[PDB]
Design an enzyme around this catalytic site. Structure first.
Site, PDB file in Angstrom:
ATOM      1  N   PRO A  59      38.198   3.644  -2.849  1.00  0.00           N
ATOM      2  CG  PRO A  59      38.296   1.505  -1.898  1.00  0.00           C
ATOM      3  CD  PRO A  59      38.705   2.933  -1.657  1.00  0.00           C
ATOM      4  CG  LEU A  60      32.021   6.054  -2.556  1.00  0.00           C
ATOM      5  CD1 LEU A  60      31.107   4.980  -3.144  1.00  0.00           C
ATOM      6  CD2 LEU A  60      31.459   6.568  -1.241  1.00  0.00           C
TER       7      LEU A  60
ATOM      8  CG  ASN B   7      42.803   8.421   2.436  1.00  0.00           C
ATOM      9  OD1 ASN B   7      41.723   8.073   1.946  1.00  0.00           O
ATOM     10  ND2 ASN B   7      43.816   8.866   1.697  1.00  0.00           N
ATOM     11  NE  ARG B   8      47.301   3.973   5.965  1.00  0.00           N
ATOM     12  CZ  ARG B   8      48.480   3.976   5.338  1.00  0.00           C
ATOM     13  NH1 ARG B   8      48.623   3.407   4.143  1.00  0.00           N
ATOM     14  NH2 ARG B   8      49.531   4.554   5.910  1.00  0.00           N
TER      15      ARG B   8
ATOM     16  CD  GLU C 195      24.407  -4.326   3.436  1.00  0.00           C
ATOM     17  OE1 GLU C 195      23.698  -4.206   4.466  1.00  0.00           O
ATOM     18  OE2 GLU C 195      24.258  -5.275   2.638  1.00  0.00           O
TER      19      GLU C 195
ATOM     20  N   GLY D   8       0.782  -1.236   0.000  1.00  0.00           N
ATOM     21  CA  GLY D   8       0.000   0.000   0.000  1.00  0.00           C
ATOM     22  C   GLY D   8       0.813   1.285   0.000  1.00  0.00           C
TER      23      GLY D   8
ATOM     24  NE  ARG E   3      19.787  -2.743   3.612  1.00  0.00           N
ATOM     25  CZ  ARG E   3      20.329  -3.025   2.427  1.00  0.00           C
ATOM     26  NH1 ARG E   3      21.593  -3.423   2.321  1.00  0.00           N
ATOM     27  NH2 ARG E   3      19.592  -2.918   1.336  1.00  0.00           N
TER      28      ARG E   3
ATOM     29  CE1 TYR F  58      26.389  -6.152  -1.457  1.00  0.00           C
ATOM     30  CE2 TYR F  58      25.426  -7.381   0.387  1.00  0.00           C
ATOM     31  CZ  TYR F  58      25.891  -6.197  -0.161  1.00  0.00           C
ATOM     32  OH  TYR F  58      25.867  -5.061   0.599  1.00  0.00           O
TER      33      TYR F  58
ATOM     34  CG  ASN G 174      36.770   9.250   0.384  1.00  0.00           C
ATOM     35  OD1 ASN G 174      35.551   9.398   0.372  1.00  0.00           O
ATOM     36  ND2 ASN G 174      37.606  10.145  -0.132  1.00  0.00           N
TER      37      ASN G 174
ATOM     38  CE1 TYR H 228      18.287  -4.427  -5.678  1.00  0.00           C
ATOM     39  CE2 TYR H 228      18.626  -5.800  -3.748  1.00  0.00           C
ATOM     40  CZ  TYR H 228      18.699  -5.608  -5.109  1.00  0.00           C
ATOM     41  OH  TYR H 228      19.174  -6.609  -5.908  1.00  0.00           O
TER      42      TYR H 228
END
Length: 261
Positions: free
Chosen positions: A139-140, A191-192, A173, A46, A176, A119, A137, A76
Site C-alpha cells: 500500500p505505501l 509482506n502481508r 501514527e 513561541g 506516535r 481522517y 509496504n 501532522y
C-alpha cells in the site's frame, strides 16, 4: 534548512522501517520534555518558524519520490511535494497558513486544498473508512506513486485521499505509537497487507485524549478512565500512564508539567 529523513519502500525490511521511525521521532522531539517516561512534542506557543517542520522523503521501487511535510508540534502531515508541485491541506488558522509558506519555497506550483487533512474528511473523499484501507509496504509503495502522479491527472481524488490515509498511519501514527509501529513492522516482516484492526483505530482516535489524561494525571493516575479496544474489538480500560509506556512513543503538548513533590 528543515531536516530531511529518507525512507524507501524498495526492498524495505523491519530494520530499515525501524531505523526510519526512530529517525522521525528523533527529529520530532528535542528531549526537553519527558513525562512518566514518555516524550512530549514541542509546544506550538513561541516555537520559532525555523524549527516548525520536518521533511520525510519517500521513495519507491517505481523510482518515484514524494516529500511529506510534518508539523513537529503534532506530527501532522500538512502537505507534500512531488517534482514541480506542492499541495497543502486547508489550514485550521491564520498562523498555520503563514507557517506553510515557509515550506517548499522553490517549488514552481503551490496549491492549497480546499479540504482539511483530518481522517474524517479524508475518509469521506476516499469513500472508505480506515478500517477498510489496507496498510503495509505494498500500500505505501502504491501510495507514493499515487501522490506523485496527482498533478498530471493520473490520480483520482478518492485514490489521493486513500494514499494520504496510508502515509499518515505508516509514518505519523507509527511515530506516535510504538504499538502502531509494531503493527507495521509485522506487515513488512511477512509482506502481508491488511487494514488496521480496532486496537490501531482506537489508539489513533484517542491520541489527543491520552496525551491530555497523562499530562493532567495525578502522579500518573487518570481522573477519568479512557476506553480503548483490543485487536478483537473488546473494551480495554486505561486508568494509568504505566500501561501506556510500551504503547505511546510521543505526546502532543497539552499542558505545563506540574512541579514535583
Amino acid at each position: 534548512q528543515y531536516p530531511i529523513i529518507n525512507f524507501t519502500t524498495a526492498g524495505a525490511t523491519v530494520q530499515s522501517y525501524t531505523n526510519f521511525i526512530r529517525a522521525v521521532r528523533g527529529r520530532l522531539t528535542t528531549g526537553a520534555d519527558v513525562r512518566h517516561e514518555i516524550p512530549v512534542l514541542p509546544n506550538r506557543v513561541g516555537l520559532p518558524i525555523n524549527q516548525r517542520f520536518i521533511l520525510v522523503e519517500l521513495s519507491n521501487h517505481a523510482e518515484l519520490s514524494v516529500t511529506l511535510a510534518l508539523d513537529v508540534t503534532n506530527a501532522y502531515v500538512v502537505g507534500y511535494r512531488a517534482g514541480n508541485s506542492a499541495y497543502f491541506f486547508h489550514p485550521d488558522n491564520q498562523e498555520d497558513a503563514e507557517a506553510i509558506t515557509h515550506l517548499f519555497t522553490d517549488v514552481q506550483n503551490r496549491y492549497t486544498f480546499a479540504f482539511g487533512g483530518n481522517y474524517d474528511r479524508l475518509e469521506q473523499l476516499a469513500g472508505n473508512l480506515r478500517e477498510n484501507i489496507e496498510l503495509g509496504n505494498g500500500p505505501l509503495e502504491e501510495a507514493i506513486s499515487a501522490l506523485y502522479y496527482y498533478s498530471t491527472g493520473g490520480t483520482q481524488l478518492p485514490t489521493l485521499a486513500r494514499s494520504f490515509i496510508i502515509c499518515i498511519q505508516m509514518i505519523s501514527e507509527a511515530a506516535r505509537f510504538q504499538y502502531i509501529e509494531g503493527e507495521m513492522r509485522t506487515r513488512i516482516r511477512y509482506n502481508r497487507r491488511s487494514a488496521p484492526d480496532p486496537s490501531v483505530i482506537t489508539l489513533e482516535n484517542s491520541w489527543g485524549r491520552l496525551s491530555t489524561a497523562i499530562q493532567e494525571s495525578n502522579q500518573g493516575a487518570f481522573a477519568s478512565p479512557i476506553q480503548l479496544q483490543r485487536r478483537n474489538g473488546s473494551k480495554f480500560s486505561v486508568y494509568d500512564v504505566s500501561i501506556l509506556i510500551p504503547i505511546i512513543a510521543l505526546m502532543v503538548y497539552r499542558c505545563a508539567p506540574p512541579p514535583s513533590s
